[PDB]
From Swiss-Prot:
Assembly, per entry: May form homohexamers. Interacts with N protein.
Lineage: Viruses, Riboviria, Orthornavirae, Pisuviricota, Pisoniviricetes
Task performed by this protein: Responsible for the cleavages located at the N-terminus of the replicase polyprotein. Participates together with nsp4 in the assembly of virally-induced cytoplasmic double-membrane vesicles necessary for viral replication. Antagonizes innate immune induction of type I interferon by blocking the phosphorylation, dimerization and subsequent nuclear translocation of host IRF3. Also prevents host NF-kappa-B signaling. In addition, PL-PRO possesses a deubiquitinating/deISGylating activity and processes both 'Lys-48'- and 'Lys-63'-linked polyubiquitin chains from cellular substrates.
Protein name: Papain-like protease nsp3
Stretches assigned to the Macro domain: 1-165
Catalytic activity line of the entry: Thiol-dependent hydrolysis of ester, thioester, amide, peptide and isopeptide bonds formed by the C-terminal Gly of ubiquitin (a 76-residue protein attached to proteins as an intracellular targeting signal)
Domain of life according to the entry: Viruses
Length: 165
C-alpha cells in the first residue's frame, strides 16, 4: 500500500514523490489526474500520467469528450487507470493562468469525497498557476476521504510541510 507519507490530518497524507512513479509502484484504486475540461493531457501531471499509459489515457479521453463534451471547471469524470490504477479520477481545478475562478478549487476537491482513498496531486498547482499552499489548505478543509498527496518538487514539499497550519 502507501508508504513514506507524512500524516497532515486524520485523512490527508503527503509525500515528496513523482505521482507517475508512485502510481506505477502502488497501483492504487484511484489516481487523480490534474485534468483540463478537454481532457487534453499535454503537460504537467496529465501529460506525465498519459505518457505512462502509452497514450491510452488520451485515446480513452478523446472518446469520452466526443461522447459527453467537455467537463466543467471544478468537475470530474472517472475513466480507466490503465497500467497505473484501477480508475483515474480526472479532476479539473481552475487554471488561474486562464482567469478561472480560484473558488472552484473547493468544488474540484469535493469530487475526491466520492472515493474512499485516492493518490492525488495538489489541484490547480504547478502549471495551473494557483498557490500550492492554498491548494493544500483547501484540500485539508474539503476532502474527508483518505487522500495521499504526491508533491514532485522537494522545495515545495518542504515549504508545504514546514508552513502547515
Amino acid at each position: 500500500s502507501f508508504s513514506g507519507y507524512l500524516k497532515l490530518t486524520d485523512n490527508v497524507y503527503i509525500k515528496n514523490a513523482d505521482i507517475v512513479e508512485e502510481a506505477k509502484k502502488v497501483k492504487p484504486t484511484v489516481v487523480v489526474n490534474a485534468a483540463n475540461v478537454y481532457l487534453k493531457h499535454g503537460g504537467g501531471v496529465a501529460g506525465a500520467l498519459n505518457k505512462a499509459t502509452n497514450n491510452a489515457m488520451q485515446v480513452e479521453s478523446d472518446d469520452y469528450i466526443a461522447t459527453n463534451g467537455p467537463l466543467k471547471v471544478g468537475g470530474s469524470c472517472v475513466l480507466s487507470g490503465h497500467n497505473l490504477a484501477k480508475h483515474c479520477l480526472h479532476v479539473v481545478g481552475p487554471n488561474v493562468n486562464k482567469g478561472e475562478d480560484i473558488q472552484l478549487l473547493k468544488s474540484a476537491y469535493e469530487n475526491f469525497n466520492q472515493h474512499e482513498v485516492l493518490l492525488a496531486p495538489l489541484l490547480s498547482a504547478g502549471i495551473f498557476g494557483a498557490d500550492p499552499i492554498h491548494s493544500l489548505r483547501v484540500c485539508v478543509d474539503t476532502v474527508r476521504t483518505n487522500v495521499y498527496l504526491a508533491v514532485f518538487d522537494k522545495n515545495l514539499y518542504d515549504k508545504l510541510v514546514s508552513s502547515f497550519l
